[PDB]
Each structure stands twice: as structure tokens, then as C-alpha cells.
Design an enzyme around this catalytic site. Sequence first.
Site, mmCIF file in Angstrom:
data_model
loop_
_atom_site.group_PDB
_atom_site.id
_atom_site.type_symbol
_atom_site.label_atom_id
_atom_site.label_comp_id
_atom_site.label_asym_id
_atom_site.label_seq_id
_atom_site.Cartn_x
_atom_site.Cartn_y
_atom_site.Cartn_z
ATOM 1 N N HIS B 10 0.602 -1.158 -0.036
ATOM 2 C CA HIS B 10 -0.374 -0.005 -0.683
ATOM 3 C C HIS B 10 0.956 1.413 -0.509
ATOM 4 C CE1 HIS B 10 -3.062 -2.796 -0.015
ATOM 5 N NE2 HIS B 10 -3.065 -3.465 1.093
ATOM 6 N N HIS B 41 -2.323 3.510 -25.906
ATOM 7 C CA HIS B 41 -2.501 2.196 -26.466
ATOM 8 C C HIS B 41 -3.090 0.749 -25.500
ATOM 9 C CE1 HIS B 41 1.320 1.606 -23.760
ATOM 10 N NE2 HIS B 41 0.796 0.263 -23.594
ATOM 11 N N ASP B 86 1.319 9.022 -25.971
ATOM 12 C CA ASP B 86 0.550 7.383 -25.628
ATOM 13 C C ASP B 86 0.147 7.962 -23.860
ATOM 14 O OD1 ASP B 86 0.159 5.086 -25.649
ATOM 15 O OD2 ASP B 86 2.505 4.118 -24.922
ATOM 16 N N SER B 177 2.622 -1.832 -18.761
ATOM 17 C CA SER B 177 2.228 -0.781 -19.920
ATOM 18 C C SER B 177 0.804 0.697 -18.562
ATOM 19 C CB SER B 177 2.017 -0.979 -20.736
ATOM 20 O OG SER B 177 2.541 -0.328 -22.023
#
Lengths: 165, 223
Positions: B10, B41, B86, B177
Amino acid sequence: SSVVVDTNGQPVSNGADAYYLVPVSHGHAGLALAKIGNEAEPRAVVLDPHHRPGLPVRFESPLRINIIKESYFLNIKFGPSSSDSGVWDVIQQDPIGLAVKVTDTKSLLGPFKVEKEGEGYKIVYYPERGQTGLDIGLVHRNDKYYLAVKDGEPCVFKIRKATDE
Amino acid sequence: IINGEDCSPHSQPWQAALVMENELFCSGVLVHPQWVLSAAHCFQNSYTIGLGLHSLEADQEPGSQMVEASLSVRHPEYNRPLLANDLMLIKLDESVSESDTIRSISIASQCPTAGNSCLVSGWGLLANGRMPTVLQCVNVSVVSEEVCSKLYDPLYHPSMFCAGGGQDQKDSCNGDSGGPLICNGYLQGLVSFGKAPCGQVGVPGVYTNLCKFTEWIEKTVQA
């Protein structure tokens, strides 16, 4: 937007796993290497009806995602992840035209994409990473099917995960 | 995350997990009570997002929330040029109560500093090909506008920056990602791309350079 899925409905992974490109029509054939005519070693990608596993591929994006969307530029390649020996490109090569051959070299952004076509998927080449795409299909010569650009005559594949291996 | 270790439970409470039929594919960052920021993406039509997780099992985490989101705004310049801009903003179905396991982070105003050690976190592949059971963390150092254009031309866009490629081979991997890169307590980047395989010696990953995008993120989230 669109996720590429294997024959079981599971997302195709980005490089992590290997898949068989299984022709929906040409079930028998499996991918392999061959000469087109009389050049020193066999770099040209074909479907050979006399090989019923074939050599499976791995689809890579540089994007740090663990799946493949139909809109991603890909490198397609044979062999394991580390390795760059089995990497698809499109080279002019008479008599076939724009053929799929392997190099041991690679760009960061591959030139291909995987798009839905009826029963399954087609591979599409994008000249100059541009907006218009050319279907990869087949040319029968020397008793196999050579992969090559044949816009409008795509060769359709389902993608079978190899976890046989 | 390549060559990190387990995060302190956490410790990274702005971390969002993007899962698809129970399976994680991307991370995000809570940057406002209704808005997760992730990788353009990473776009899907609907999201299931874990908040306040460590292990990826909600029940096994007290304070955890599984929210839903129908809605995302990709930067209007995404993939123009390729791999550039992105980032996208996922609006949550309902805004959510900050707790101690769940907290928004401010985004950095200044641009990254070459040499700055920053933290990266997510649930993407380890060095060994396998997925981690608990959220991972690693320290990567920002590299220079020059070493990043050299490594990545002609695709380097000033909307990216590079970090890692130390000797000890620390990097982002597949599934990291749209997760965070924290420089000096602020959100400085998201995980975007790099060469493949991950963890190449002396090869940094690319990160969406969020200093470019503060006026777009502010202006979007008020509307």
C-alpha cells in the site's frame, strides 16, 4: 481497440508465447523455410503441406503490454524470444513479387498487423508504416505455398497457442 | 518489472490495475478521484480497475475497490507521430473516497532531470518470464534527451523520455504499461515501450513525458 485472440478465446500475448498460424482452408500445411529458386540459403516463408505442426511464431510490439491489438505494428518471428534470427520482412524477389523472407535483423516497430478476416485473422503489410495495408496471401510454386503480398486474396489463419511445447 | 523486489504493501496507493476477464493487461495511476491516467495504447471500451491492491485478489486485500469505467479520452495527437502522445484519461463510473490504501497523486510541472533516480511499479513480467504475485517496484535513473534520440530515432518524440539501462539491468516489462514512474514524490511518467526483449544491458525504457500534458490533463478533468 481490438484484441487478437487464439483458438480458445484467450488474448494472444506479446512475444511471451508462441502460436501456430493454422490456415482455415489449408489445415494440412504448416509454416516453414524454403528457397524461391536457386539462392544460397532458404529465407522465404511458406506453407508446406508435408509439415503438420509447422514452425510457430511470436508477435512482438515494443509497447509494454502483455496482449496484441489488431491496430499494433508488429514484428513476426520464429524461434524463442531472445533470438532475432527468424524475423519476417517483405523483400522484392522475382518470380514471386513482394515475398516474406526472414533476416537475423529487426526494427523497433515491425511492418505488419493482424486483422480479422471471416473465420479468423490475416497478416497485413504496411508499406512505409503508412495508412494503407496489403494482404499477405500465397503463390503456389515448387509444390508448396509462398507467403507474399496478394492484396484482396488474404490467407486466413486461426492462431493456435503452442502450450504443447 | 525486471530486477525489482516486492513493493511495501500500500506504499504506491495511486496504483490502478487494468484487468480483462480477471487477467491484468495494463496499470494506471489515480490522478483525481474520478480519473485514472494510463497508456493511450492501453485503450479498451470498458475497464475493470483494481484500487488499493497489492496482491491482485480483492478479498485478500482489505480497503481494495473493483470500480468500472465506460469512458476514456485518448490524447487527440496519439500515434501521430507513431508511438507519441501515449496517454489517455479513464473517467470512473463513480468518484471514490481516498483512504490510506487509495490516494490521488499530483503530476510533475518541471521536465525530468538526467540522472534522477525514480521508482517504477506494476505487475508485469519478472526477469524469469513469470508474473509477480504482489506489486513490484524498481529504481531507474532518467537518461539524457541525446542518449534517448540516439537509442530510438527516428521515433523519439519530445513527448517521451527514457530511464534505466544501468549496469544492474532494471526495466519495465510486459504488463507494466500505463503504470507510474515517480520522480521526487511527483508523477513524472507512464510505462510506454522499449526494445524487445526487456532488460537489455544499457537499454532504457521509454515513458510518456507527462510535463508536456499538464494543461491538457487539467483542462480535460475540469470539464
